[PDB]
Structures are given as C-alpha cells and as structure tokens.
Nucleic acid binder design. Sequence first.
RNA 1: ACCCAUAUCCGCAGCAGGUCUCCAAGGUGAACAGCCUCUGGCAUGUUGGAACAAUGUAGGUAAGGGAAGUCGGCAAGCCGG
RNA 2: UGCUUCUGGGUCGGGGUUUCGUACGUAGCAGAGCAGCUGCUGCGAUCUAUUGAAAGUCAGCCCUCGACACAAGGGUUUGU
Lengths: 24, 131, 61, 60, 107, 394
Amino acid sequence: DPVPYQPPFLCQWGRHQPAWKPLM
Amino acid sequence: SGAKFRISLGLPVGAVINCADNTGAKNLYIISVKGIKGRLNRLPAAGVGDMVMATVKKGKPELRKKVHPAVVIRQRKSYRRKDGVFLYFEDNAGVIVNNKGEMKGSAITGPVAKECADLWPRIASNAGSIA
Amino acid sequence: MKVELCSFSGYKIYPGHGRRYARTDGKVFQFLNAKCESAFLSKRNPRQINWTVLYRRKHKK
Amino acid sequence: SMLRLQKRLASSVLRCGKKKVWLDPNETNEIANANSRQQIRKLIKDGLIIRKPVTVHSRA
Amino acid sequence: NEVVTREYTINIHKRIHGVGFKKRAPRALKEIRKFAMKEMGTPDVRIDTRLNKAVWAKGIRNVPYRIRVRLSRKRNEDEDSPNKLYTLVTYVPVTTFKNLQTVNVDE
Amino acid sequence: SHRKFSAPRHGSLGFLPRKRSSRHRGKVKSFPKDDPSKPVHLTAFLGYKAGMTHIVREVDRPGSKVNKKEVVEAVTIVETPPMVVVGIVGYVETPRGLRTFKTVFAEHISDECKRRFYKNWHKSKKKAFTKYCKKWQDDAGKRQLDKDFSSMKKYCQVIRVLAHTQMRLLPLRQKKAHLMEIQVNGGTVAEKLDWARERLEQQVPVSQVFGQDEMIDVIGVTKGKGYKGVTSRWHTKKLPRKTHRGLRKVACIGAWHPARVAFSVARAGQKGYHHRTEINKKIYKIGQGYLIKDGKLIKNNASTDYDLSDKSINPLGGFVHYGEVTNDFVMLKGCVVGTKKRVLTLRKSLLVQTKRRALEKIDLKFIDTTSKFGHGRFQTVEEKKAFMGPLKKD
RNA sequence: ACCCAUAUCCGCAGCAGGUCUCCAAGGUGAACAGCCUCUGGCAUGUUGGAACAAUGUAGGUAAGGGAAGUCGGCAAGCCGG
RNA sequence: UGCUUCUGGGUCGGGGUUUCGUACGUAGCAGAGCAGCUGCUGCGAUCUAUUGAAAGUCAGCCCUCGACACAAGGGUUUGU
Ligand SMILES: [Mg+2]
Ligand SMILES: [Mg+2]
Ligand SMILES: [Mg+2]
Ligand SMILES: [Mg+2]
Ligand SMILES: [Mg+2]
Ligand SMILES: [Mg+2]
Ligand SMILES: [Mg+2]
Ligand SMILES: [Mg+2]
Ligand SMILES: [Mg+2]
Ligand SMILES: [Mg+2]
Ligand SMILES: [Mg+2]
Ligand SMILES: [Mg+2]
Ligand SMILES: [Mg+2]
C-alpha cells in the first residue's frame, strides 16, 4: 500500500531549543 | 559533678519560644544554640536545659531588636528520662539568662523540668513548681 | 519502683511503659498509651467512655 | 454457538434493549436455527425467551 | 474411597491477606481451587455458580472471612479425560462458624 | 575545583563488601588468646535470639547524677540450650597458615547432628558414619584412634572442640542442628586434649562457659532487607523535589579525568543479611530453664530477689515470632544483631576488660513480662484475671 | 442502507488529537457543578499469569520546629458552602 | 528449612494474647414530646440491663495432641 515516506524533519537541535547550546 | 545526659531535641533555629518570666517579653526567636559543633545541613537545636541564643521578637521595645542569651526550660517534644518516663510539656518555654547563669526576671511561670533544674541552680531557686 | 495509676483510664502503669504529660499550670498526668493521650487531648469524659475504670466505679459493674 | 443475531432480533421484536432479552441456556440449538422474526414470535409464544423485568429503583 | 462427599470450612482471610483491592475475589477463587487440589488430588476442579455468588455477594474488595464448602470427589462422566476423577465444589449456607469441624458426611 | 563546604563521608570503607554472606551461622574470626596459667574452659557459645523486654536495676557508679536510681534498659533474651560435644579437631601451626591436622568425631552422634551432613534428609538413606562408628568396638580401630590421639598430644597446638545445638528442645520449625568449633584456652596440650576427651559425648551448659556480668562479643548475621537504594543503604542526602531523574539517588558519582567510578562511591545494592561482630555486650543474668521436681514444674525464671513472683520470662502469649523459652537462657544489655529465630554466636572478650562501667555488679529488681504482641498492660495471667474479674466466657 | 466517533471522517493507523447539531429522568443539592441509581450500552480501551526488589509516575500521611531549603512560598498545605 | 520411631508437616476448631469499644434480638412507669381511646395503645433520636459485649487474630504471632485427610512418591544426573 502506501509506502511510508522519509521521516519528516523535526527541527530540533538548532537555536530555539535551550537543551543543547555550546559555546557562544 | 553529675553531667547532663542526652535528651530529645525539637527546637531548631527558627522557633519562637514563649518567655516565662516577668521581664515583659512574649516571644523569643531562637537564632543559634550555644555548644554545638555543626555539620553540613544540620540545624542547631536546643532541648530542655540548653543554653541558647535568643532574640525578643515582640514585647517591650527595650528588649526588642537585640540579642539576648537564654535558657530553654520547657519543650513540647517528648524526651526520655533516665528512670524510664517520657515526660513532655504543653508549650515551648524559655527564660533570659546571662552568660554566667544569673536570671534577669524574678518569678517563673509554669513548671521547670528537673533536667534543667539540676543543671541551672539559679533558675531552680526561682521556680516554685518543679517538673 | 512506684506503680502510678493512669489519669484517664485508671490502669496500672509500669515504669517500662507510659507517656507522662505535664501542663503549664501543673497537675502532672500519667498516660498508658496514645489512645488515652488522644482522648485527654480531645477532652473526653472518662465517666462516659465504657472501657475505663471510672465508668465501672460509676455504674457499679 | 452464536445467538447475538437472535438476541438483536428479539430486542427488535420486543421493542426494548438486548440487555432485557433472556435467552434459554438449555434450548440453545432450538433458538440458533430460527433466523427469522416469524420463528422468534413462535419462540415468544412457546416461552423459551422471556422479557426480563425492570431492575427496581426504590422511592420509599 | 473414591466417591467421597465431605464438608470443610475455608478461612479465606489467611489466604487473601496481602493482595490489592481489584484482585481479591478472583484470587480467593484461585485459592479455593488450590485448596480443592490440595486435599483432593484431582486437577479437574469444577466449582459451582452458587459458591461464585456466595464469594461475590458483597463485592470485589470485601470478601467474607470464613466460608462453608461441600467438597465431593466424583467419578468422571463421558467426554473422558486423562484425569480419572473430578472434584465438585459446592457452597453450604451456615449462619455462624463457631465450632464447625470438617464433618465427613455420608451418601 | 574543590568542595565548598566540607562534609564527613556517608558510610565506612571498613565494611564495603556489602554482599549477602555465604555462611548463615556466625563464624568466629578470632578466638581469645590462650595462656597456661588459666585453667581449661570453653571460649565461645552458640545461642538463639528469642526476644526483647525491659529491665529494672540499681545503678552503682560514683559521681554521676544517675547514682542509685532505677533505670530501664533494653535487654535481649537468648535461649541457650546446652550443646552436645560430638568431636574434636587439632591445629598445627605452619608458616603458610594455621592448618587443621586431624579431626576425630565421636562414636554416638545424634540425629540432629546427622541432619547437617545432608541437604535432603528425606531422600537420603541415613547411611553416614556407619563405617566410621565401627572403629570403637574393635581391637585395631582403638589402636588407630590411640595413635591418632597420641600424635595429637605431640604435634597439635590449637585444639578446638565440635559441639552442636540441641534443636529438639527448641520450639523452632527446623530440626537441623547447627555445629560449631569452640577453641579451648587453658593449660598444656595434653591436659587440654584429655579434658576434651573427657567432655566428649557430653552436654555442655552455659554456666560452665560464661558467668554473671561478663563483657562478651556477639557474632551474627544482619536481618535481611533485600535490594535497597543508596538513600536507604548509605543514608545519603536526598535530592530536592525539582529533580527530573529521581531524587532518592546519588547525583554525582565522580570527576571527569578519573575515567572510572571509585570503590568508595556510594551506590545502590544489597542492604541487610550481613555477617557482623559487635563487641562489649554485658550479661545481666544467666537464667535457669524449666525443671520438674516433686510433681509440679518450677518456672519462676523472671523472679528476682525484689519481685518474689511466680512468673517466667515468657511473656503473655509467648514471644513475638519465636515461641516459648523452656531451656536455660541468657539476658544481654542493649540490642544484638539478627532477627527472630536467628542463630547467634556468643564469644568471650578479646580485649583485657578493666573498666568502671564494665566491672559493675548488677542487682536486678523487676523484669517486664508483659505482652509484647501489642500494647500489653498486664504482667501475668493471674494478675490479669484478678484485675478483669469473671468474664462472659468464664 | 450504514458509520456520524476512544474501530466505518481527517491525522501514513482500530492514533489519549480534531470535527457542525437534536432528544435530556430519580435522589443529594442554588445548579445542566461533583457522587450513586433507572431506560439503553460496554468488557476496562494493541494482552495476560506469578511476586510486591531498587529507581520511577499518579495518589496520600508524618512526632517537634514552621520557610531556617531555594534565585524566588516552586510544589504541597491553610481559608472554602 | 520440613517431608512414617503410631511418627511428622498441614487444614479446621479450641484456648493464650491483642485491636476496636458494649453487637442483632428482647425487656424497661428511662426518654424532649406528639396522636387516638376512657389509665391504656401507637411514633420516637437517645439511655440502661442482657453486654469489658459483638467482630478480627498470621497470612511472617503462642500452645494444641480435639476432628480431618495427607505424608515411605515422581523426574534429571554423576566414578578414583
Ligand atoms: Mg546547605
Ligand atoms: Mg576542603
Ligand atoms: Mg524540570
Ligand atoms: Mg510488639
Ligand atoms: Mg438512515
Ligand atoms: Mg480503540
Ligand atoms: Mg485498568
Ligand atoms: Mg482486557
Ligand atoms: Mg510534620
Ligand atoms: Mg504537629
Ligand atoms: Mg532562605
Ligand atoms: Mg540558604
Ligand atoms: Mg502555588
């Protein structure tokens, strides 16, 4: 049937997350 | 001669004990207990017959806003006597007593426990009822 | 050894047991257990509660 | 074997729910081959299936 | 010797002590089945709907403490099994459990 | 960086193998040292912890406030049946280690001692010691045993005796008796082995070993508590409420650059069921057991010189989770390690004990025999009946 | 014809999400608030069996002190008709 | 840890202890009172006696030698 598509990009580790942020 | 045995302690830094004499003070905020070494995150606590540092929170303005030395007489926490009785009181009570041992007030309301009366002789002399 | 009676109940308190309670006015009471302690602190009449000794002395059982 | 068809049809004939439809546990094969409202009315007249009474709700 | 009908009083409390509220009465049924398998060595134990109602009379949480059970070992009817005999478990209505022995009744 | 506010460490490095002990009976690691001036005597014993009660006694210590007062203290009842001697063992002294030389069992060995050599007594054919007991009624076997004892006169240095408990008089469920080596410290090796051969196949009571007001050591296994967390075991400080990944845990294990966790880091594991050896326990009384003469039995074990009652140390309704004590018993100050029905090793004191608190003579006044199963308020059955009166059931 | 929604729609699906409306008992109660029951419906929501270890999540209770903890009365608790 | 010396575990019951606090029924010229009949009969919360009564009590409490059946079994393995 439907071929499950490529897993949608979940914009995580970027800049809006304050979980992981290096040295600024 | 006869030293003081250990008793249960239930008045840490923060307790307001009522002042059981005729000076004029109503409350006594315990600020620190005299004679405790200390350890990380342990509140110094005072039981029956303990020399403590207090401050008159409310009462006469001559007594407020200054540090007094005090002796804790009565506590509500049940403490074990040596003969095997758990004698506990109604309220938490102390008196203002200087660094040498002499009292500031004349009379003492309420009963004074014998664990405090054997240690402090001048408090036991002014006390009418004992324990 | 002084076997003192209970204030609320009237039972024979032995020196190994009991919890003694002294008020601000005096009149030092002895209590056998926390049942009698809670009954006295909630101020119940010993002559009305059935299992006490004062109820038996009142109603002649 | 399979009596949900007969229970639904008996509820539709008796004009109530299928909770109150009491089917006969002894005569299972006699009910299982009815498969029609005309046979289920014959089962009503025979008394094999019985309308359950209403569970009481007291006002006293 | 084989066909034996006899009475017992089960104390459900000493077997049901420990379990939680939603798992008291089915566990009570399970220990009654284990009791029947314990006295009578038959794996085929068929307990009665009257005793089902007698256990589930109050609720799933409050289970009665003592109960009265007629335990009967019976020879097997048709639809034969490797289990040679079975055990029928029946409720007996008794008002008070004061001085109730395990009476071995006769047929 | 360093720690800001320095703190003492939670736990001890001396006890860090906190694993479940392999042995269940308390093994003596070190017996007291012998000296030829002292006569021969047993230096250890194996009791069973029965229960706990009060005590009332006079305190005789000069200078204290508690002088001549009636204190109460926690005491342990340890039921101590007399043990049966069923063998001896000699020990030669090697530079590698104190090595056992030759073990000589007894002729008549009771079935309670026969239980120990089998794991499953029901399937076993009870055929132990059958070819060994034939050496005591033949001419050559007695000569071989005399050669064995004559070699043990010469070459053995330490002679321990084998004694097993008497489980039949005990109210426990098990029947498998515990065996134990007890080192005899006394005179020379020949006199020691002769006294052990004289005490072979004999009862050993408790008064021959211990006495009144003697400081003893208690060896025993801790009450088991299972797999517990680090807050429950090492008693560390709890993390506050706002922690996401748990609060009854250890927050930081160690530093970065040590790439391993050290052995001293408090972790979660086994709490309870640990072999321990507590020192300096004081015996208040070695009580006599039940004995029958002139028809009626004599049971006034809790009777002191000041009580003058007929009551026993068995409380009302028996001890909690142990049963009734019928054998002779001992009564120790404080609390001892182990739960109810736990085997418990008594030992004489290693340290030369000369202290003012240790050399106090105890005179008992009152022994509380109330029902420990609940809040008891009566001492004995006749006092309870005299207080209650005639009941409905009576 | 049927589904009209914790299985018939849309969310990759028998997805704790979303979707426009009608019918509207008895007691307790101011109430269409919360709880139980009557008509109707259901098997506890992609499973169970055996023990109740540590960490947890959701609930609770603590003698004496009553914010001394913490960046901060955060959370919980007190008052409640 | 236990699993046939007419001996042992277990089930039930009985005592021992202990928790709560006086059970259903019956009686009462006890009961604030109310109603009907010429003192009696009904409603009535609560109180007293029967009644330190009733209920629970090892699942991880203590003795039973009082009734009961069970318990000398089944399978896998190992040698100088
Ligand atoms: Mg700090
Ligand atoms: Mg430092
Ligand atoms: Mg967070
Ligand atoms: Mg207890
Ligand atoms: Mg349609
Ligand atoms: Mg679903
Ligand atoms: Mg569920
Ligand atoms: Mg399900
Ligand atoms: Mg609190
Ligand atoms: Mg409080
Ligand atoms: Mg602060
Ligand atoms: Mg701070
Ligand atoms: Mg808030």
